[PDB]
Amino acid sequence: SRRRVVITGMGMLSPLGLDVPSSWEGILAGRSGIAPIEHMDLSAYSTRFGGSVKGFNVEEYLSAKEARKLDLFIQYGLAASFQAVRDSGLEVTDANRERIGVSMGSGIGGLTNIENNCRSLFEQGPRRISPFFVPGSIINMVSGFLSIHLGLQGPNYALTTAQTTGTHSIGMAARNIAYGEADVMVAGGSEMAACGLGLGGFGAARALSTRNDEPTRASRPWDRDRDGFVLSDGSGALVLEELEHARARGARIYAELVGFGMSGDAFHMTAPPEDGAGAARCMKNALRDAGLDPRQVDYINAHGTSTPAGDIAEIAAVKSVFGEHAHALSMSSTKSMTGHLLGAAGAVEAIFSVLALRDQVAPPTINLDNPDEGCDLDLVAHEAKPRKIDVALSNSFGFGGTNGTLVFRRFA
Amino acid sequence: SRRRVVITGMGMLSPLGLDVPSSWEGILAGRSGIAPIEHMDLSAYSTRFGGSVKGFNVEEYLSAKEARKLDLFIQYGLAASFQAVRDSGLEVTDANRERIGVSMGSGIGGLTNIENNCRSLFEQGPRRISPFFVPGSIINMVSGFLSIHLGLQGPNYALTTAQTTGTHSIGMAARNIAYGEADVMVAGGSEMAACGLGLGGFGAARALSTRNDEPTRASRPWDRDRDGFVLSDGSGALVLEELEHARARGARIYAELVGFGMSGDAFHMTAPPEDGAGAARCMKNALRDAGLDPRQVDYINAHGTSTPAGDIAEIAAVKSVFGEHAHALSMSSTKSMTGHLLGAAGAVEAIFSVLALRDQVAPPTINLDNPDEGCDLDLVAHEAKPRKIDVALSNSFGFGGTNGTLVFRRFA
């Protein structure tokens, strides 16, 4: 006998914009946020482009003193969190602060800060390591700093499930509210892995696109010429709220969160099984959680990373769960435009799924010039598609075979 | 309709032993696991000792080839997880594999591997980064690799809540089972932060004991001469199981998990409030969750890190929650012997709390020569104390003001 959970605020940094409306305008226009990386020298690397956050001004959110302590992934998570809480109009008081929590996560966390501190350590020894190195670099410090700044005393934790983090963070936060452990949660994820270790680590695994001549064409989910994912930075946050709580204060409700599914593939450390069996189990678990028939799904925001094996596994899983209904729904990958924000991917894609419901439009899969063998569903190639969307699903599948699915519905 | 949750298996690597029985024998004997660190040169560091895992043989669990790809924190978490599943006697089958999940977490994760790959990048170049850098370093890969090796297809995730990680991992895993999302979970935490960035980062904060001439006396919770925590390595895992599921297969039940609390302090990024208000809120949440009178608590395994501020905050929190009953319960810090396993602390201390119920004994606080002002409870100084224990609490507090409490009870 679970409580209902609605979305009352959203916030974001992405390669398409410094907030949700600017990002979404880009999504509906089919704009690429992918460009050559300017913030470090990648002349000797096989991939020299990605999705950067452009023109981020941390002093809109933090003092220079505060910002110097915190890794960029924490700055980005706090920017999205602050935006979402402002967007919600929630007032934190002594009467409600024990009922408001935070679960903001990251896949990889503080790589840039670890690189910088490794420079000090190797060239000078331990005495030059920052006294703020540990608290400024660990993944739970978005949740930590947001709770201290806003006086949030509810459940305070952080998920780290690689590329599934943002999806699991939102799902588990929704369960906190549904089961009475909180009335409000700020949830989502953040990532800034564009450093030598990030580009070099994924480069060494040969996982990245190397289309340096045309970065905007590199991310091409389900296209026959795809050659790996595009690495991107950013953050997404949602304010999740118990429905009667939202109604009592006259909150603007964007959508309802009706289902959350999880599964493990138990298959391989990085590759999905060819048939997407774990992804299928995860989507079926999310529909059973929501009490929905597969035929009720109108739109899927795919994981769709532009990897050879991953994109085909997702078609196979959708065909398995939805049967002939797979030919009626629309499915798109916004990673075609944003690239892969890793731990933040599921958070920004949850927001895109909520806005697909608000605006009754399926975002395009750009760059889908020549769909690959078996890639024969409605993948919204090239241009956004206005259509009826009552139910939207968002998928994330990550290293270790860890899967998450969120189901959103229009709220009346 | 919440289901009951019991503990049916446990596993561990600690500074006292390579499994649960050897570690617990050390605990009941008042043995220190703390020694000068041998695995690197710390002559330039202000702290040169800690709790290392001694004589670990990963080849008892994994191929040498597989182990070379994995940070030590992942090797340690897998070892504890394998032990716990073997200890439980559970058989993974097609009929139950979707109902068995894993939530193994870490505070800092793969710092040694990230440091070593950073050294390769800076001194040689990006082509020397390991192709296994990402999957061998990120925190979700204990859950990932355990699910691949055992065939576990249920909920697969990882928490990272700094020094609260193991406690939160066990509590949220118990909620998964209680609410019907799984029937079995393997849950706990692992840590190996003894690298330059670890010892140097905590050293730069002045958080560590610097008692280099007497490492076995350094960790001295509530003692007037304490001067900071002792950094330690290892892992703990529990098999959590729905009660009817355990009974149906004739499982040996160690104890029941009856309560779980979370709270945020919302106070400071690293320091606890002097009055322990967040810790008190957390313990009250956990006792109400368990439907208990506070007078039912017989034993508290304290966080008890040997910090000036933390240890006195915990006395204040216990006096606030328990009133006159604070003088009737026994409370001890096993960190007096193990040191602080950071994200694994809550997992190993949950195991010690369960063994205090099995053996009807309060583990000692060693080194408690001169209890500090106001530290006037039964802190089980020096020697283990046999006594009646029906209910045991385990507390963890961490950076970002994150708090967790587990309540365990004897099972008939």
Ligand SMILES: CC(=O)Nc1ccc(Cl)c(C(=O)O)c1
């Ligand atoms: C459908 C499915 O299971 N896809 C999947 C799983 C895991 C990863 Cl890591 C990726 C990817 O990033 O391409 C794709």
Ligand SMILES: [Mg+2]
């Ligand atoms: Mg000792």
